[PDB]
Amino acid sequence: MGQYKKLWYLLFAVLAVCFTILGYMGSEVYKKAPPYPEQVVSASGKVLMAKDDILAGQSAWQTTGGMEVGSVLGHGAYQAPDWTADWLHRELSAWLDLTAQQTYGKKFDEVSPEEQAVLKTRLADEYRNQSRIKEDGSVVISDTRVKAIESILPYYHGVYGDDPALQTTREHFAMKNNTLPSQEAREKLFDFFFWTSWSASTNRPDETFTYTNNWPHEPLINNVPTTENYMWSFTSVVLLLMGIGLLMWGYSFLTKHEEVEVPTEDPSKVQLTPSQKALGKYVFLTVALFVVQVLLGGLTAHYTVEGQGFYGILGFEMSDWFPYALTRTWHIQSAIFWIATGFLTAGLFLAPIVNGGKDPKFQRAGVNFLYIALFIVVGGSYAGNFFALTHILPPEFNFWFGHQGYEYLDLGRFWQLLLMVGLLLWLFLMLRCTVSAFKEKGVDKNLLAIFVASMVGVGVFYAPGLFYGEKSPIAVMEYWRWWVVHLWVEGFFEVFATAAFAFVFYNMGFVRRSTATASTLAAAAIFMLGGVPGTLHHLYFSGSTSASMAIGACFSALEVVPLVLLGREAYEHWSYQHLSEWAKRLRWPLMCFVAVAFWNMIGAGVFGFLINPPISLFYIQGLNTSAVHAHAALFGVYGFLALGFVLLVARYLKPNVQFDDKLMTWGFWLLNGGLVGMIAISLLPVGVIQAYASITHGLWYARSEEFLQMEILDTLRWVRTAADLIFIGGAICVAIQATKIV
Ligand code: HEM
Ligand code: HEM
Ligand SMILES: [Ca+2]
Ligand SMILES: [Fe+3]
């Protein structure tokens, strides 16, 4: 390893420690997740439900879209109410009304606060302590609780069915007129909802807080943040402040920046291999998927202000066939697909360059096979989502060929397996080009080794999404799912981008070999240190114990080291005085990387940390601030990276076509202005108002229909269309430039 032995050892130690921590917390989730009770029995002896009924309700929830229609335990969509919190509040209000009648003969509202406190204390004792699971695995609830459940059932039956008395409510929730047509399936789904509400309001066996760390905020049962929550939030802010102070104090020593002399030629000296020439279809697929995804996002926003549609007398009803759940699922899946496609194309273009400008036998055939597999995956998953949400798909094939119901993993298990096979094919095609480069003499191989390791990580770490099943517990499913939406996208993709950037810069002669290798190794070590144990900030209130708040909060704060220095080195080199001898013509792909740094600083650093401490997330999980952070971080870092990658690939495929700077300036600035406007004028104010309402009254109230249909919040969502149109125009401009080039 030569002079990089210390960096390699530090990376190894960081990897070992961080995966040991993450794996230990994984085994804790299997043993400490909220159990499914064997029986839920009334105090008189009548069984309400059983474990099989709860699991059947979970499967029924998966056939409606799951997280893509409302929210369960804080994860999902944001137009329909959070179901666990809404059910808890309605059952607590019904219990209070019933108990006030048998004690004072009046309702809860018309009773003096002195006895309201007594009623609230009796509710808190009954719900948090008397509902604890027993030795035999059963839960005993009172007849008053049974009556409250029976009283609140008809509202949910009308909401998830087609009752005329609840038509307006269904429209405000962006829900089709029959989300779950089967009454028997609706009854099971309400059992599942009750189970989630029970797990969110019942103390742990040997603790004074619930299985969800007192989530959601519910003043009626005193579901408030715990001392551990406060203690670890304070610790995480203190760690972030130290880290920032230490990075300021040591930036001078840490970064030496031994710059090299700028060359004159273009080592652009790339006789293109047949496999490289077959990536124009990849570039076109990336930009077409980007345009389709942006259009699907515009179509989902329209459902949040109208509910069913406008005009289209065209002869069918559109929410019956392409409802909000379907449009949002496709919108989320297309974004994942096109960002991943851009990264995979970029890698496939660099592989033959690593191989010395030659194709290993059958590389073009492998590339074409991968293209066909990616097309089949996308088309089949979308068709399965359509047929599952229309309920034409029989329910026993839903989890495998329809809608999984889990966000960011909505595609069926069969399509997930096909995508995994395609990713392994891509890794094989990348790795077969490295054998000759490794089998050389004299040349240092540390940068190649770190690049190959980042190849293996991207091509491998989609597997943890197959470690749960249809009937797997929700907390296990959430753990394995964030192993993919956070560790594989947020992590292992920055590593790939960094290792490709270093490889390209070294082979263009912009940086020294030692500088590139050391920078890549250090960046990989800091990204793994801040990202691998930072997975747990998605599991603070998902049935995990209190150790998740601690780990996720403290290490996620450690992910401040890269974000800051990011791009300083660009402003250190932005002022060039026509130093771009052969780079000002390609100014656009190289400027997608300055907006990348800006959005990494803003969307991922500012908006990502205001939601990170558990004391904040306790109130703002499930609100529009999550949408703000998601849009900013995801497109501003990774969509721009992928767009720059496919623009740079298209530049080398067709070096005789110039870039039309007037269409490029328009597209770039329309994208950046549209993103800025959609957060700053619509998304952020809605999130702030929702956060205030949540903190003051309850997450139930911040997600309620009565609160979302306020005059200020409907005009705040309509105004978004102005920035949405600008963003769609910018996306269309970029996609035309790319199509014109290839
Ligand atoms: C015209 C531009 C866009 C519009 C109008 C738009 C609109 C929307 C809407 C309406 C939602 C659903 C919020 C809800 O639950 O009610 C959403 C969610 C989302 N959008 Fe977009 N979007 C746009 C562009 C993008 C882009 C470019 C990306 C990234 C490639 C993206 C990624 C996402 C993600 C990841 C979510 C889910 C976020 C979450 O659940 O927190 N969007 N968007
Ligand atoms: C570019 C890097 C990042 C990307 C692409 C990214 C992406 C996302 C996305 C799409 C979500 C949506 C969650 C959902 O739909 O359920 C999310 C949630 C979250 N992210 Fe990030 N993120 C990034 C960096 C960060 C950083 C640096 C932090 C911490 C400082 C962070 C903390 C969170 C938290 C706490 C949530 C949960 C919000 C909620 O569940 O309601 N993220 N992230
Ligand atoms: Ca979400
Ligand atoms: Fe995350």
Side-chain angles (χ1 to χ4, degrees), residues 1-258 260 262-264 267-268 270-310 312 314-575 579-742:
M1 308 165 138
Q3 84 213 62
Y4 317 96
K5 196 197 246 301
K6 295 215 163 353
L7 286 162
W8 277 113
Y9 283 3
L10 162 84
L11 170 65
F12 294 154
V14 157
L15 267 186
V17 160
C18 290
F19 279 103
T20 303
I21 289 166
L22 189 59
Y24 159 76
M25 275 295 291
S27 99
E28 199 86 346
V29 162
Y30 275 86
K31 281 133 73 163
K32 253 70 164 302
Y36 295 78
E38 303 298 318
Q39 268 180 349
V40 179
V41 187
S42 159
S44 315
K46 183 178 179 180
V47 183
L48 286 100
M49 49 196 102
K51 188 167 138 134
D52 274 11
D53 299 312
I54 305 181
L55 290 172
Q58 174 171 325
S59 293
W61 178 58
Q62 297 170 359
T63 88
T64 74
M67 292 171 190
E68 303 283 351
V69 161
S71 193
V72 163
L73 286 171
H75 291 140
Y78 307 140
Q79 190 69 20
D82 187 278
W83 295 118
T84 301
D86 197 73
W87 181 285
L88 184 51
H89 184 258
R90 288 182 179 278
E91 197 202 320
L92 297 168
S93 293
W95 191 101
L96 283 174
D97 273 358
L98 281 160
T99 316
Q101 280 276 172
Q102 329 168 345
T103 323
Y104 319 116
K106 321 193 256 291
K107 316 278 312 281
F108 188 59
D109 279 6
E110 52 221 38
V111 124
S112 78
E114 285 77 90
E115 33 200 352
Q116 285 202 346
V118 174
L119 284 179
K120 266 198 289 267
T121 203
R122 283 169 63 188
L123 171 89
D125 187 64
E126 157 152 321
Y127 262 70
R128 308 175 65 89
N129 301 305
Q130 297 180 28
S131 287
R132 292 172 133 128
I133 212 177
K134 305 178 129 37
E135 268 304 67
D136 50 5
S138 63
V139 173
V140 176
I141 60 162
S142 53
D143 322 301
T144 311
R145 194 157 175 185
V146 172
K147 279 200 294 281
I149 294 162
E150 296 176 330
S151 97
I152 76 167
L153 272 173
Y155 165 80
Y156 289 102
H157 267 290
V159 155
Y160 264 89
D162 57 10
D163 191 21
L166 269 149
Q167 178 70 32
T168 305
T169 295
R170 259 183 327 258
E171 290 178 356
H172 291 165
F173 288 170
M175 276 173 87
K176 67 187 294 199
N177 254 6
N178 233 320
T179 313
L180 199 50
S182 181
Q183 219 252 345
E184 290 103 30
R186 234 142 57 213
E187 286 166 353
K188 301 272 158 293
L189 156 76
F190 306 148
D191 284 339
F192 170 72
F193 279 176
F194 163 84
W195 171 77
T196 66
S197 148
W198 168 91
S199 81
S201 37
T202 288
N203 284 324
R204 282 180 165 288
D206 278 300
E207 314 269 32
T208 41
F209 48 85
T210 78
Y211 288 92
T212 64
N213 285 302
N214 281 2
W215 191 94
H217 181 209
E218 175 55 269
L220 285 177
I221 55 140
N222 292 121
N223 249 23
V224 295
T226 76
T227 75
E228 293 100 325
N229 185 314
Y230 286 111
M231 225 281 320
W232 291 120
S233 306
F234 172 78
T235 290
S236 79
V237 178
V238 153
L239 285 190
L240 174 93
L241 278 206
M242 303 204 322
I244 270 176
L246 182 132
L247 181 84
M248 294 300 293
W249 176 90
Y251 172 74
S252 55
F253 309 146
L254 194 70
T255 299
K256 293 179 179 179
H257 193 78
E258 318 141 358
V260 84
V262 49
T264 59
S268 184
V270 43
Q271 293 177 335
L272 289 172
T273 84
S275 157
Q276 266 160 338
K277 283 206 275 277
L279 297 191
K281 64 172 137 286
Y282 280 71
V283 173
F284 177 73
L285 169 67
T286 297
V287 294
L289 256 183
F290 174 42
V291 155
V292 159
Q293 185 246 339
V294 164
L295 281 187
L296 290 163
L299 179 56
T300 179
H302 169 259
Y303 275 128
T304 62
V305 306
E306 296 261 67
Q308 315 277 37
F310 59 88
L314 168 160
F316 59 88
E317 183 178 2
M318 222 222 161
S319 68
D320 277 348
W321 298 101
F322 306 94
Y324 162 93
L326 183 66
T327 79
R328 193 183 188 276
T329 295
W330 286 356
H331 179 54
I332 273 88
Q333 291 304 313
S334 316
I336 295 159
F337 280 139
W338 83 258
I339 287 169
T341 300
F343 274 73
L344 296 175
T345 159
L348 274 177
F349 184 85
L350 287 176
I353 291 171
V354 176
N355 201 48
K358 293 179 179 179
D359 265 0
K361 203 184 223 199
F362 301 133
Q363 188 91 353
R364 207 225 299 201
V367 162
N368 294 340
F369 286 167
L370 176 59
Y371 184 85
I372 282 164
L374 282 163
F375 225 98
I376 280 170
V377 161
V378 167
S381 72
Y382 283 13
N385 296 313
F386 171 83
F387 281 120
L389 290 193
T390 45
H391 285 290
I392 288 126
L393 191 64
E396 54 283 2
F397 308 107
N398 169 77
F399 188 79
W400 274 81
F401 302 94
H403 208 297
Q404 259 193 60
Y406 309 136
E407 201 176 14
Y408 302 108
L409 290 178
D410 314 277
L411 75 160
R413 179 49 56 89
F414 182 77
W415 315 113
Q416 224 182 324
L417 279 171
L418 196 44
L419 179 57
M420 178 92 245
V421 172
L423 282 157
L424 289 181
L425 169 57
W426 174 89
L427 179 60
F428 164 70
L429 283 168
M430 302 287 305
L431 284 196
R432 61 190 314 226
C433 290
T434 67
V435 162
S436 68
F438 275 122
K439 271 162 27 213
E440 281 202 11
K441 274 334 172 203
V443 47
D444 175 88
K445 279 135 200 163
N446 292 293
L447 188 63
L448 174 65
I450 198 48
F451 197 18
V452 164
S454 111
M455 275 163 230
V456 166
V458 162
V460 150
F461 266 72
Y462 188 76
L466 315 165
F467 292 170
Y468 64 89
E470 176 181 8
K471 308 288 202 173
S472 289
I474 297 293
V476 167
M477 170 306 283
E478 294 260 14
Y479 172 79
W480 287 125
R481 169 169 78 103
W482 292 113
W483 261 65
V484 165
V485 186
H486 171 100
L487 199 41
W488 185 63
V489 183
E490 316 191 17
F492 282 127
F493 265 32
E494 317 164 359
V495 181
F496 186 70
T498 304
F501 263 88
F503 184 81
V504 165
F505 285 151
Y506 166 68
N507 288 73
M508 298 209 186
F510 288 131
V511 289
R512 343 286 313 287
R513 187 192 257 293
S514 65
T515 286
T517 301
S519 295
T520 321
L521 278 178
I526 295 157
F527 292 144
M528 281 309 101
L529 175 73
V532 170
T535 312
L536 293 178
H537 65 228
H538 304 277
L539 312 151
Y540 293 158
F541 321 108
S542 290
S544 91
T545 68
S546 69
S548 99
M549 281 172 313
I551 287 125
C554 295
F555 290 86
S556 266
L558 284 173
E559 179 70 1
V560 64
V561 193
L563 220 129
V564 177
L565 5 93
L566 232 79
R568 249 183 172 180
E569 227 359 276
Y571 172 81
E572 317 313 273
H573 275 343
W574 209 108
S575 43
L579 250 172
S580 300
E581 317 305 301
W582 60 290
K584 196 172 183 179
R585 53 96 72 72
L586 61 61
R587 73 192 254 220
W588 300 114
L590 182 297
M591 245 210 333
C592 274
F593 304 142
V594 184
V596 163
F598 172 82
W599 286 112
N600 193 250
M601 232 166 312
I602 291 318
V606 174
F607 292 142
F609 178 82
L610 282 190
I611 69 170
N612 176 59
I615 192 44
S616 179
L617 204 41
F618 187 89
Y619 310 98
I620 67 173
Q621 182 156 120
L623 303 183
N624 273 63
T625 40
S626 291
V628 174
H629 163 66
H631 277 93
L634 192 49
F635 180 74
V637 185
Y638 297 93
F640 263 129
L641 268 181
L643 293 171
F645 277 171
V646 294
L647 282 185
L648 199 67
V649 165
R651 154 93 300 174
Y652 279 104
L653 287 191
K654 309 295 253 252
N656 281 333
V657 181
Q658 350 166 3
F659 258 61
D660 191 14
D661 289 345
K662 273 186 180 181
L663 173 82
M664 212 57 246
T665 193
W666 266 109
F668 179 82
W669 284 122
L670 277 164
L671 277 170
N672 284 113
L675 182 53
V676 161
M678 102 185 12
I679 284 149
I681 54 90
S682 174
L683 265 170
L684 196 44
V686 162
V688 160
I689 294 173
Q690 249 180 2
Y692 174 81
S694 155
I695 292 173
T696 307
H697 302 95
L699 180 81
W700 73 269
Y701 187 58
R703 301 279 302 253
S704 43
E705 162 192 2
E706 299 77 20
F707 179 81
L708 249 91
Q709 298 298 133
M710 268 177 333
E711 203 221 311
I712 183 52
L713 287 194
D714 179 67
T715 202
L716 226 38
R717 255 191 327 267
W718 267 106
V719 158
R720 205 211 164 143
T721 61
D724 296 319
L725 280 203
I726 281 155
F727 198 90
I728 301 172
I732 278 157
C733 289
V734 160
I736 292 169
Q737 178 60 249
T739 303
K740 254 176 160 59
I741 292 285
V742 308

